[PDB]
Write a protein that binds this ligand. Structure first.
Ligand code: MG
Ligand code: MG
Lengths: 148, 280, 78, 140, 106, 103, 59, 166
RNA sequence: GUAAGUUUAGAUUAUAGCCAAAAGAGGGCUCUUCUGGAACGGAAAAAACCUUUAAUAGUGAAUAAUUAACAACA
């Protein structure tokens, strides 16, 4: 499946942790139905947990739209431009609450095979190895068997 | 003909996917699409960065002159520009960026510390930084996608609005976090273009009253083949200052000059890492 | 065949360990008679636990709450 | 024909999406593609374990090259560092040799010296002072 | 630095990926406490097997908490079939190394 | 001269133990190349392209045919001829347009 | 260190020329040294996909 | 059955602005049911690829195959409509961008054998497609020079990285 | 030292094995009797010999089995 799929290297959006950490999630949309058994669990989430989540995360704008609906759905958008969409059909409050927290922590970068765990832009402090390191020089720079 | 409508419904969705790939839709600004409230979006912008802004000032920054022209033309069939804030914001950034660089690299020449500031205030860096902070989404203009000169202007206007509200010390942290970070992993001459590096080196050595260097061939391999390696070292007063690798003697010798210059100005690869630790 | 050097050594090392096993098994702390009855109480208690679990099977309680909670499937915002 | 399966289109696409990068009729014929995909998945699972073993061989190969530049064989270098209470693993040692040549040379001398101390202790017999680098710190 | 069950060669501004949940909020600073070696251009210090707390201090930050991409596990069995298959996804976290400091207490 | 490795090529190794005996200190300054061990640059007679053109001299038949041209190329770069032949359209269309870059 | 990107890469992967003298030596022992350098197993940057061999000259 | 090649002639672009290169004209033409094998027609359609209208018509006039005459007549009609309906100025200023053959609807019959046996016979048909683009034929292919080959080889060597390490 | 065993009620499938190692009996087969086995590692490929308590992610670590062995006098 690796040869059947794309891959990338480990990175961060804008050097997130160097100076100050910025939260990538910026918008949430949740759609509901007033009276539909499928969306009962989402309704309870609005009743109890929606306001508390908004306060703990003040950089995210949350939209709640009751309307005639068949499947409740959540849309998450990020600063780098990614968009993610999830169905919430007939799920419990606990399931939805835990799902939302995962979205907050994520950065919009694609979830695919990552080639290496570690990324460094300054791998060497003493100088990268080349063949001439560890080779002694010679007087007058005479290559082997040169008479001079 | 099978009974049921659910399979027909599913297939309509796939036909939608196929059509999009073949005929990608033209870009649209997020304001047009649903789930948009301008007032709420602006407030989250400030809180996202852990900085406090005055709402009246911040909104003015996003407005652009071209936007006013479009509205009036539609109107025939008040506002207030960000021009004042743009000039103030850009001016401080140039001075603030220069102050950072000189302390870090005092020896480095004046022309150098102008190229780096020009490099870090160009469209490439500013436009790239602006988009990932949502500045493009909140901009008001007559053309979308926003042209880079327009996008760049609105970015510095925002810094100007931050300067007025919270003063110099806060803005200096803002420039460090978002603009100075962009030089991580960048070699000096990648940001500053110098032709004839040897000529510059000779003048610099004269100022400190040092003798002109003597070029010599420290190491050699495969000279007569089509893939040769050369090491050239600049010797001063029979003392080594720099050593450089290259394909040809001329290329390798030029490489030694750049190595020497970097050490003189203290912009080496193994130099002390920049400091973001200070909370003040 | 010829037995390789590795095989000969590996076998010797295992022989040496077993030799020590013989030694440490030659010095019983208690004789047979002293052992008799020294652990009777603990053993008897253990079986009592086993028997109690075996004879404890029975159906489970049924509650009105479980049956009537099914009606919440049609809860709504009025 | 009272009841007929109406979803066969999507059940077919599940297999065929994993076969688009094959060559031949294996990438478009279901009866052939299905056999090839399961063989690929079996290989994918068995190669997760084999990968870890392969990388260790690569590390040992590169370490032998780095040590021999200083005149040391691989067994001597690794063993003596352990006797000095150094617990660096093979993966990190390869990084130092490639990216920290001076630090690697320092470790090369340390391992060589500890080897020499062991040789002296072996030849000399009786009670003699132990080597400076042959002293073991204790924990409790 | 020895962290989790792995050893990492580290420097300031580096990114590290840990393949399990950590219980730390995003944006939080941490101190790595098992350090085996610290080095500079001209000198290096080696612990036996660990350096003392006074000498070296390493700090890191939690940047992202995520999950891995789906991994396919399909045991080898007669009558393998294409649906006798499992998908494994593990939680992950990313740390950015911030600073390394030393003090003159040798 | 306590170091057991010669100090003349890469660096000078000085190894010491702290008083408590819990840390090992390493001092490794670099060694610079002596002036007496260098050669003068041959200023009297250079871009790598010029070297290639002299190597890949077109002398007979103007532009040579595939086969003879490939034999010339293999000698210059010390390869076999098989390296230089093209491939079909199946392999050329599989190639990635934008492979990832690390740093 | 402090080289430009391209010269740094060129230096690391360059190919070296070596000399061996075979007078009175056994051919088998000579082969071991030559095979080591031909494959590139003398370099800490060795990989089977990197083509890191060197030239060997025997007289 | 699909007939899309015909409708391609009815696309209308918006007027070009003054500061823009002049867009060349395009013509699509085909003949649908032909009593000829598509495999045989392929060799004829392949030959005239990339050539100008006059060179194509010259080579067709001296070919002995039955397909050559049919292709020539289709080419002549395409030239006539190009000037008459698609605002082409000069007849000679045209070249063949696309030319290919396609399968048609066929018929099944019986073929007799010698012991009361039989076989299934197909009476085969094919289509022919062309696209004419105004302008001189684009320049031909030039094989890579020895210097060009080498420059690629150095590029390959420069791309190498240290694999599976920090 | 250790956790199974009997009674009651219900229910099929199966009723030809294979190789290694012991002891016999009719004289290489053929029967009878006790023990063991069914690698993804090893013995060159390797159902049956040897190492091996289940199955998961990791660019960690310590080990097991492991086809080779070193022509006269005295
Ligand atoms: Mg292993
Ligand atoms: Mg037929």
């Amino acid at each position: 499946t690796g040869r059947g799929t794309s891959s990338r290297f480990l990175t961060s959006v804008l050097h997130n942790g160097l100076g100050r950490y910025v939260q990538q999630l910026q918008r949430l949309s949740l759609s509901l139905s007033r009276d539909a058994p499928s969306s009962r669990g989402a309704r309870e989430f609005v009743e109890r947990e929606v306001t508390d989540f908004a306060r703990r995360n003040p950089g995210v704008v949350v939209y709640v739209n009751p309307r005639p609906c068949a499947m409740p759905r959540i849309v998450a958008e990020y600063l780098n431009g990614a968009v993610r969409e999830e169905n919430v059909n007939s799920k419990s409050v606990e399931e939805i609450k835990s799902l939302v927290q995962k979205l907050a922590d994520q950065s919009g970068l694609d979830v695919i095979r990552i080639r290496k765990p570690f990324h460094t832009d300054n791998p060497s402090i003493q100088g990268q190895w080349h063949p001439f390191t560890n080779k002694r020089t010679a007087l007058h720079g005479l290559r082997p068997r040169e008479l001079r | 003909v099978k009974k049921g409508f659910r399979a027909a419904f599913r297939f309509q969705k796939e036909l939608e996917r196929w059509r999009l790939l073949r005929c990608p839709p033209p870009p649209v600004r997020r304001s047009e699409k649903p789930n948009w409230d301008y007032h709420a979006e602006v407030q989250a912008f400030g809180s996202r960065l852990q900085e406090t802004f005055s709402l009246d000032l911040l909104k003015t920054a996003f407005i652009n002159s071209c936007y006013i022209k479009s509205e009036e033309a539609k109107r025939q069939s008040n506002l207030k520009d960000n021009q004042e804030l743009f000039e103030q914001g850009l001016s401080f950034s140039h001075r603030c960026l220069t102050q950072f660089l000189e302390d870090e690299f005092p020896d480095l020449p004046a022309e150098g510390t102008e190229s780096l500031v020009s490099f870090l205030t160009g469209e490439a860096v500013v436009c790239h930084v602006a988009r990932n902070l949502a500045v493009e989404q909140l901009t008001l203009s007559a053309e979308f996608p926003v042209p880079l000169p327009v996008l760049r202007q609105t970015f510095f206007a925002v810094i100007g609005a931050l300067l007025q509200s919270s003063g110099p010390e806060r803005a200096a942290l803002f420039i460090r976090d978002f603009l100075i970070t962009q030089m991580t992993g960048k070699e000096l001459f990648e940001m500053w273009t110098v032709v004839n590096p040897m000529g510059l080196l000779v003048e610099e050595l004269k100022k400190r009253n040092i003798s002109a260097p003597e070029s010599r061939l420290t190491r050699q391999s495969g000279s007569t083949t089509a893939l040769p390696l050369y090491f050239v070292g600049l010797y001063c007063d029979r003392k080594l200052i720099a050593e450089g690798p290259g394909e040809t003697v001329l290329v390798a010798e030029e490489e030694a000059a750049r190595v020497a210059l970097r050490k003189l100005y203290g912009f080496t690869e193994n130099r002390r890492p920049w400091d973001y630790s200070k909370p003040k | 065949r010829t037995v390789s050097f590795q095989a000969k050594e590996s076998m010797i090392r295992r022989l040496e360990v077993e030799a020590e096993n013989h030694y440490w098994l030659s010095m019983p702390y208690m004789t047979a008679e002293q052992e008799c009855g020294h652990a009777a109480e603990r053993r008897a208690q253990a079986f009592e636990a086993i028997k109690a679990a075996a004879t404890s099977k029975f159906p489970k309680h049924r509650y009105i709450a479980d049956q009537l909670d099914h009606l919440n499937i049609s809860k709504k915002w009025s | 024909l009272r009841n007929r399966l109406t979803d066969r289109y999507w059940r077919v696409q599940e297999v065929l999406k994993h076969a688009q990068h094959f060559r031949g009729r294996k990438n478009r014929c279901y009866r052939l593609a299905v056999r090839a995909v399961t063989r690929a998945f079996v290989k994918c699972t068995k190669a997760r374990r084999l990968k870890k073993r392969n990388l260790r061989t690569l590390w040992i190969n590169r370490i032998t090259a780095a040590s021999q530049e200083h005149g040391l064989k691989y067994p001597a270098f690794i063993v003596n560092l352990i006797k000095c209470q150094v617990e660096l693993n093979r993966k990190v040692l390869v990084d130092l040799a490639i990216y920290e040549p001076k630090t690697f040379k320092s470790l090369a001398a340390l391992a060589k010296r500890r080897q020499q101390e062991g040789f002296a202790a072996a030849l000399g017999d009786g009670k003699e002072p132990e080597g400076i680098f042959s002293r073991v710190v204790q924990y409790h | 630095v020895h962290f989790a069950s792995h050893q990492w060669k580290v420097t300031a501004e580096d990114l590290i990926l840990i393949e399990n949940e950590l219980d730390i909020k995003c944006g939080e600073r941490i101190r790595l406490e098992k350090v085996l070696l610290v080095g500079a251009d001209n000198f290096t210090l080696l612990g036996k097997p660990l350096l003392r707390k006074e000498l070296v201090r390493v700090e890191a930050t939690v940047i992202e908490k995520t999950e891995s991409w789906p991994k396919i596990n399909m045991k080898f069995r007669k009558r393998k079939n294409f649906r006798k298959k499992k998908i494994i996804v593990n939680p992950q976290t990313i740390l950015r190394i911030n600073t390394i400091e030393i003090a003159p207490r040798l | 001269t306590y170091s057991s490795l010669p100090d003349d090529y890469n660096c000078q190794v000085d190894l010491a133990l702290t008083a408590d005996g819990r840390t090992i200190v390493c001092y490794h300054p670099s060694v610079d190349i002596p002036y007496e061990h260098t050669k003068p640059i041959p200023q009297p007679d250079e871009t790598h392209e010029q070297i290639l053109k002299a190597k890949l001299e077109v002398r007979k038949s103007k532009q040579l045919e595939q086969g003879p041209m490939i034999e010339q190329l293999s000698k210059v770069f010390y390869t076999t001829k098989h390296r230089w032949y093209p491939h079909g359209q199946y392999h050329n269309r599989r190639k990635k347009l934008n492979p990832p870059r690390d740093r | 260190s402090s080289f430009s990107r391209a010269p740094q890469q060129w230096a690391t992967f360059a190919r070296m020329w070596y000399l061996l003298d075979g007078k009175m030596q056994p051919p088998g022992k000579l082969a071991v040294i030559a095979s080591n350098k031909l494959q590139g197993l003398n370099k800490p940057v060795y990989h089977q996909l990197s083509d890191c061999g060197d030239h060997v000259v025997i007289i | 059955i699909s007939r899309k090649w015909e409708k391609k002639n009815k696309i209308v672009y918006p007027p070009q602005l003054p500061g823009e290169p002049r867009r060349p004209a395009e013509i699509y033409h085909c003949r649908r049911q032909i009593k000829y094998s598509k495999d045989k027609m392929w060799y004829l359609a392949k030959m005239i690829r990339g050539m100008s209208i006059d060179q194509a018509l010259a080579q067709l006039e001296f070919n002995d195959k039955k397909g050559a005459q049919i292709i020539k007549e289709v080419l002549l009609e395409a030239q006539d409509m190009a000037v008459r309906d698609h605002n082409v100025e000069f007849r000679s200023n045209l070249h063949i961008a696309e030319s290919t053959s396609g399968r048609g609807q066929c018929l099944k019959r019986i073929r007799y054998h010698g012991r009361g046996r039989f076989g299934i016979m197909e009476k085969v048909y094919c289509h022919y497609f062309v696209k004419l683009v105004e302008g001189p034929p684009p320049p031909p292919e030039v094989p890579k020079t020895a210097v060009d080959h080498a420059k690629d080889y150095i590029q390959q060597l420069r791309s190498r990285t240290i694999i599976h390490t920090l």
